Amino acid sequence: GQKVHPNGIRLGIVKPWNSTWFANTKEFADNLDSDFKVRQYLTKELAKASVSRIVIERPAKSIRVTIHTARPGIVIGKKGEDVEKLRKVVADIAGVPAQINIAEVRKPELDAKLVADSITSQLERRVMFRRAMKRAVQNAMRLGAKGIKVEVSGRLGGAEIARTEWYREGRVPLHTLRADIDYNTSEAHTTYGVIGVKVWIFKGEI
RNA sequence: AGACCAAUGCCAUGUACGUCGCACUCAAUAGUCAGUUUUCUGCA
């Protein structure tokens, strides 16, 4: 087990943080756990909506949750009853007056959360993994994407030993720190157990 | 160059490699008949 998380080593360099509140030591743990609850809830209740990121920020006793998603229409719905329902329950969880926004992730096959969730969904619909991976690399390289690597792992095809079998195309410069590597990871709970899907997407060199 | 260095339970090893798709709507040509009599009308 030996590679650094390629989001974490780029946190001040190119990648931003998904939480951008300041807090002293008295409320740092409380704000942090409140963020675990709103991302847990808001991740479970938008499983069909293809959600990429949820960014929390707290401007002066009020949360401001931004849902980067690929299907904004299914998040908002017929006149946005679903949004006001979500800020009602996020205001229930965080205990502050909640705002909520939706940022449309166009080009959803270049986002690693959406790619890993895609391949994970296909693996738990019992399709063969080489199609899922290989289709994901092809259609991601089709639109921009100066590199992509996907990597499934663990008891693939229902075996009794676990393999990995990664694929990559293009250039994925993972030790370069100015590389805009969009990396994310999902787990596929199949009837044989968990299958881990990692995906790195190299977008640009700065 | 050219001292000395002995041995290393029992098994089965594997899953596993067989491939795809697209579409679409605009125009001619119902019905309308007739219209007193003439005439100067700048000039070189």
Side-chain angles (χ1 to χ4, degrees):
Chain A
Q2 68 264 47
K3 290 177 200 44
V4 78
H5 187 285
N7 187 19
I9 193 67
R10 269 71 179 259
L11 278 177
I13 314 304
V14 289
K15 304 299 285 175
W17 285 267
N18 301 317
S19 294
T20 53
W21 43 266
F22 181 81
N24 282 322
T25 318
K26 308 282 296 171
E27 65 271 13
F28 200 88
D30 288 328
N31 289 330
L32 200 53
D33 176 69
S34 173
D35 296 347
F36 291 109
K37 297 292 209 184
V38 304
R39 296 167 195 271
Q40 183 177 32
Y41 181 74
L42 202 59
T43 297
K44 182 183 176 157
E45 293 294 329
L46 292 176
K48 301 152 203 285
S50 297
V51 57
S52 168
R53 293 168 69 244
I54 28 189
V55 171
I56 311 295
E57 64 186 2
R58 300 187 184 196
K61 300 288 287 209
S62 179
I63 205 170
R64 181 69 63 82
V65 188
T66 300
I67 299 166
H68 292 279
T69 188
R71 290 191 206 168
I74 199 195
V75 179
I76 297 170
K78 182 213 305 273
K79 293 312 293 148
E81 194 271 329
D82 294 330
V83 168
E84 63 193 2
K85 178 158 68 65
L86 290 174
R87 67 171 187 85
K88 183 144 153 75
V89 293
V90 165
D92 290 330
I93 290 171
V96 296
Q99 282 184 8
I100 188 164
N101 297 121
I102 288 97
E104 183 175 358
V105 183
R106 65 190 165 276
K107 298 171 149 86
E109 76 273 7
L110 297 183
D111 184 77
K113 179 61 170 142
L114 303 176
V115 173
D117 182 71
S118 172
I119 300 164
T120 288
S121 298
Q122 295 174 4
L123 291 176
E124 65 188 354
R125 291 178 176 86
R126 309 159 72 140
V127 316
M128 291 164 165
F129 61 91
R130 285 189 293 271
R131 290 182 188 80
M133 294 178 61
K134 195 163 160 203
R135 287 177 199 284
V137 175
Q138 285 170 3
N139 63 8
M141 293 296 291
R142 178 185 182 85
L143 273 82
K146 297 183 186 340
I148 181 167
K149 175 162 66 169
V150 308
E151 193 268 330
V152 311
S153 67
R155 201 191 229 277
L156 291 79
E160 290 171 340
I161 49 98
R163 295 174 291 180
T164 63
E165 198 162 358
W166 60 277
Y167 289 155
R168 73 172 156 73
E169 288 295 326
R171 190 161 69 79
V172 182
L174 209 42
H175 275 232
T176 302
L177 299 176
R178 63 178 174 210
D180 185 73
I181 297 283
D182 188 74
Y183 165 78
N184 210 335
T185 302
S186 183
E187 291 195 347
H189 299 92
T190 63
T191 191
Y192 293 101
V194 179
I195 297 169
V197 177
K198 295 189 173 86
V199 46
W200 298 262
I201 296 170
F202 177 62
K203 288 184 171 59
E205 302 79 8
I206 194 169

